[PDB]
Paper text:
More than 70 factors participate in the dynamic assembly and disassembly of the small subunit processome (90S) inside nucleolus, leading to the early maturation of small subunit. The 5’ domain of the 18S rRNA is the last to be incorporated into the stable 90S prior to the cleavage of pre-rRNA at the A1 site. When bound in 90S, the Kre33 module is observed to hold in place several elements of the pre-rRNA and the 5’ ETS in the assembly phase of 90S.
As described immediately below, this density is identified and modeled as the complex of [name] and [name] N-terminal domain. The final model of the [name]-[name] complex contains [name] residues 168–453 and [name] residues 1–141, both with density correlation coefficient of 0.6. This interaction resembles that found in the complex of exosome-associated exoribonuclease, Rrp6, and its binding factor, Rrp4730. [name] and [name] each contributes slightly more than 100 residues to formation of their interface that buries a large solvent accessible area (4843 Å2). The additional helices of [name] (α5-α8) and [name] (α3-α4), on one side, buttress against the central interdigitated [name]-[name] helical bundle and on another, against helix 11 (h11) of 18 S RNA. The [name]-[name] complex establishes a number of electrostatic interactions with h11 via mostly arginine and lysine residues.
Residue numbers in the entry:
A (entry chain NH): 97 to 274, 282 to 317, 326 to 445, 453 to 983, 1010 to 1116, 1128 to 1237
B (entry chain NI): 3 to 27, 32 to 105, 120 to 189
Amino acid sequence: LFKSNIFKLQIDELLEQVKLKQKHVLKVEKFLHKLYDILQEIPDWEEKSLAEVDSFFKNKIVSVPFVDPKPIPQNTNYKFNYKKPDISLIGSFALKAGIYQPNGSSIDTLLTMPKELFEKKDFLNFRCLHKRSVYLAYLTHHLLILLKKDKLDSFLQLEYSYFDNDPLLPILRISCSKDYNFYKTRFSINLLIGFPYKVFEPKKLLPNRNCIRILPATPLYNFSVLSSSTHENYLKYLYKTKKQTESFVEATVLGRLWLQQRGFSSNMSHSGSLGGFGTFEFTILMAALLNGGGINSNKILLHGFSSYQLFKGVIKYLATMDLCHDGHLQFHSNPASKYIDEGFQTPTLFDKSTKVNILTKMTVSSYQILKEYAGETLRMLNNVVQDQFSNIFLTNISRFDNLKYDLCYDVQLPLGKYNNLETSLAATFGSMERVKFITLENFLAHKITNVARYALGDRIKYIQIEMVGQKSDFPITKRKVYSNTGGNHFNFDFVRVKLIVNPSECDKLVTKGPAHSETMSTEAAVFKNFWGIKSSLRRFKDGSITHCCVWSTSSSEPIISSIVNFALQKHVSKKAQISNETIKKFHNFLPLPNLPSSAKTSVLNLSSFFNLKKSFDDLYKIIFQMKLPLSVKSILPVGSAFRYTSLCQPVPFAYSDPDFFQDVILEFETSPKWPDEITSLEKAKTAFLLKIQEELSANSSTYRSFFSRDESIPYNLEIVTLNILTPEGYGFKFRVLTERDEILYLRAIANARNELKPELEATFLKFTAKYLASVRHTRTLENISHSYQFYSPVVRLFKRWLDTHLLLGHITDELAELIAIKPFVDPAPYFIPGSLENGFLKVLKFISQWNWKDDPLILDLVKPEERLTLAQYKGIQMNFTNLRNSDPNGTHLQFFVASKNDPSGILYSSGIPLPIATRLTALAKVAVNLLQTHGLNQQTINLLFTPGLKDYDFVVDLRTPIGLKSSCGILSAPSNFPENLNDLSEKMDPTYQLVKYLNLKYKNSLILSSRKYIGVNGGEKGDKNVITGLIKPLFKGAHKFRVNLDCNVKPVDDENVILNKEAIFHEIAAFGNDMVINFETD
Amino acid sequence: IEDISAMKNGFIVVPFKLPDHKALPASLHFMFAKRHQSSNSNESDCLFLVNLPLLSNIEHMKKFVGQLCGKYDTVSHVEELLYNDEFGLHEVDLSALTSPRNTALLKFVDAASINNCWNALKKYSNLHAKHPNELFEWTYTTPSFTTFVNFYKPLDIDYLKEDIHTHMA
């Protein structure tokens, strides 16, 4: 099988990044044997009560981190004595769970509180937690003396730590810092004092039965009590499943790779953090799948599945799982294993005879994000078109938090002391409510998630929260792990909620909300209270009643922050301000069109582009209705009006914008009677074209027309193009393209000499550079623009960043426009386009991944469920390999612009300089690193938008009087077409045309590099032309003596001279005298 | 620099003194002129130019050898002048493809009429530093926006319709 063979080759290269060492295993085994010998020296202490435990280790240097509240004799209804410690060779080393990944790992030890200290009568109302902590505090004195025989204190240290961000669960910190040292293993340890086996019955550990009976469903207290009681039974069942299944090690390796790709581990997930689905979850999910017993009690998998077969099976079963809102599972010790389809809308898999809810550590809110990622993972596993087998498994979701998350709302939680928790937080919990939500990260986050579900509703695809400031190191000298986190005695500094929002259902800002009727709906009546004061029940469009939620959408700020400010201060509490400052800092820095309601409408609204497209469609329908003596075929637009994804939208009545003209290609009928010459065919085909150009100003006087030759094409300036001007002054380019260029390159190319043999096909290459399949490309771009509305703002942010960096002027524009749709059409192996900054960061990461010197780029145009097959992509891969073999440095074609309609790869990637592309790729990687290092603010937004613009041959600093900022639409009122074509051309800034003419004349020696978006780079001024100097090595020194080579060889040396710097400066003196600021010799 | 105004390829260089503005670094526009003898009419007892400076004008190429005109009052005739390109895009014409080297306009009809023009410029090649005051300051015109205005303006319909009607037969 190809799937069972190519997957092993794709995983073995990355297997060295998580490989193990035999010397590290031997050092870990020696450290574990020394730790087991140290733990065997802890004997049973005397019979002690709570007061006698306070007589032993109250004011001790080594005291246990007791679970909340503080250790007092108020609830001392039982005793508390240190018992005999029990240790075994179990934990992460029992199944080799430790993996030496790039981020490392840790280990686990078989440690628990004995039955002499923990009792089933003290399990109710959390009385056994104080008894086990006092026993651990009494045994900590023996741990610092009798069990401190590791003999590695020079390289290792002993400390107390909290497990899973909870003070009740401890973690033993005995590892070598950066005899019993684990420096070769480079891993940590974790051990606590939990309840014994079958200490709590399943009736007492039921979902309705809380261990801390203060009772509601304990999401953390009952889950940890069931986990501590049946950890060894679950580990023995997992070891028996790993012994029965030969490919269980490969399934656990694929499960760890998928958990690393998802950025999730076996930590807490229902406590407002990322975790749950990790090594502990995959050890039970793959065991239950291999043992069978699904929702229909059928065999989900077996031990006979292959390594790639079980990896594809686990990827398919991840999206097809039923644990949170679609079912539950129930496994015995090893008597049976069966599941059900009872969706409880909460993650819970209550085991049959093991007596543990497996999914209780996770949450349905985290499962909603998990099911969304697993659906794309199962779709990518089913897809066999892209060769991202190693890419998808190694792409961590949490590696790029800015790219993978569209928006994040973070606030500072000043929790204060124990008597100051009611100031910033208003999560009023009663008796049973504080039993289930004792933590401030549990009570306030559940109130925030309930407020978000009631107000936004369908406007959030998933819920993810984080509580920064939780102390992990348990203070042995103090009571527990409590630090000054945001001015709080408790460990809770800041709260951040990741806005995982589906953009289709979150596009409502001020519209109908909760529907009301004659019957008083509880959601509709309390919609005003749920949305702050916003969603009062009003009328609807169809005569019904619906709430009117109030949210503000801005082109310079985020709409999530306005929705949060409207639906939290008047709904929960006004003491918190969760917003994204970088979203407002980047959207304000992003350019916007000069049209009405520009700040009122967001980036998803394209009414200005739709109005410009409707005016172009009405002009095209009038042209199609008009008939002349010469028959035509079609008139298709491929310009900015047909694109609607540029740096700026269609501004109202732009006079002299850089993208003011919308290109429309018009094709005539079959006219092969014209001659093969370009001038002869143009004169033969203009019998009715001159009459059509004259009559277009009369029959279509609302628009305009012209007849001018275009000099943009190489060696072709004998055409007649209509410079159509709208009644408001909007530009359009009705260009008529003939078939004489392809006929001359095919049939009339024999007349070309040796100086024109390679240029014989250049006439057809210039004609097909923007007219080969641009009509089909513009037709297919309407579905992409309708699907990915945020891709237009991402392309706008990418074009504005390229204009500010000034590194997009040495290439074409078709390749730059088609490269921004990769992160939206092909989101794998990352997130889809949800934000403009996230889309631009993913585009820079994709450009950095597609290294032009290493791997030529290749892509296929796939419609949103068109796509090319692997055999169809084999020709593009062969053309990219042939281009890489011909140009390893990529001097003529660095990155291959390969598409379905461009299988050659050099359709729009010809003439790009290798050092300019290498400098642009290095600057983009530096700016992505600088934006991540500068936090999330305007400095990080300007980290990718402030080039140095210095240390070049010519410094980019000019002063010109031809200011055309208002005519270009870039602000610091025209509403009609200009009087003359020369006056309209003089209204624009000619400094960019003079810089381009100087760069074209001196492209061999002194290239005046600039940006493609002249209007975006100009901005407020729009007059000075930035010309970065790129100097060849023959601009100041000496070259070979060749006066017949048409070079600038003159007397500086005898004959061995180069293009002289003083001669080049005097040559460019008159060209730059109108904008004379700063330029000199090389 | 200015005194070194001769080439070993048979070219006497006329170093044109130019006004060093803020687009330059008294600038020495280094341009050479080699006495060519071939089938071209510009080589008929004249010197083919080399290393032609950019930003040409009506008499900017004559001002490159203007030390001969500024001292000897050069008066002559003209036969031909070629190998001059504004941007190098004239090598492959549109109609030509579908169906000396870097020389400016520094040439004459012969050598007897150019004894005050070409022979004086050869004398001014050695006297580029001796007669720099006789050499004219090459302060050519600034690049105005009218050239870019006329380039981007629409063309006349009747200018192409008359050629289309003439070539229709």
